[PDB]
Ligand binder design. Structure first.
Ligand SMILES: CC(=O)N[C@@H]1[C@@H](O)[C@H](O)[C@@H](CO)O[C@@H]1O
Ligand SMILES: [Ca+2]
Ligand SMILES: [Ca+2]
Length: 122
């Protein structure tokens, strides 16, 4: 089961993984990491984060061009919900090229080595 908005379904099994491992899990399941493109999609992801009590990865990253967060298509964001002061590319100074979502629905850029809840979209 999962949470759905329109034709998109978000699912989790409560796995917690690094970004690269999370991406692999979703792809092997024939989906991709959660990619909220609207307020309504963001709220569905947020509900799951609240339930699981763990920040989740989103798909988007700025590994290609620093500060330009893109989907797995390489396209720029059509929606964002950054927490106040984010994205800051600064884990106590160190680069942050991946994105986590909080249980309040706001986003923070993080090191892609961080271990976070895996939510996939289908
Ligand atoms: C690894 C991690 O999640 N670090 C976060 C950083 O990303 C965020 O910008 C900062 C805000 O003050 O809090 C923590 O340092
Ligand atoms: Ca960055
Ligand atoms: Ca940050």
């Amino acid at each position: 089961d999962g949470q759905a908005v329109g034709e998109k379904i978000f699912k989790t099994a409560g796995a917690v993984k690094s970004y690269s491992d999370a991406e692999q899990l979703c792809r092997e399941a024939k989906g991709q990491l959660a990619s909220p493109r609207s307020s309504a999609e963001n709220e569905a992801v947020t509900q799951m984060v609240r339930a699981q009590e763990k920040n989740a990865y989103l798909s988007m990253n700025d590994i290609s061009t620093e500060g330009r967060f893109t989907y797995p298509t390489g396209e720029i964001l059509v929606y964002s919900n950054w927490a106040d002061g984010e994205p800051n590319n600064s884990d106590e100074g160190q680069p942050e090229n991946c994105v986590e979502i909080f249980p309040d629905g706001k986003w923070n850029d993080v090191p892609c080595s961080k271990q976070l809840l895996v939510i996939c979209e289908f």
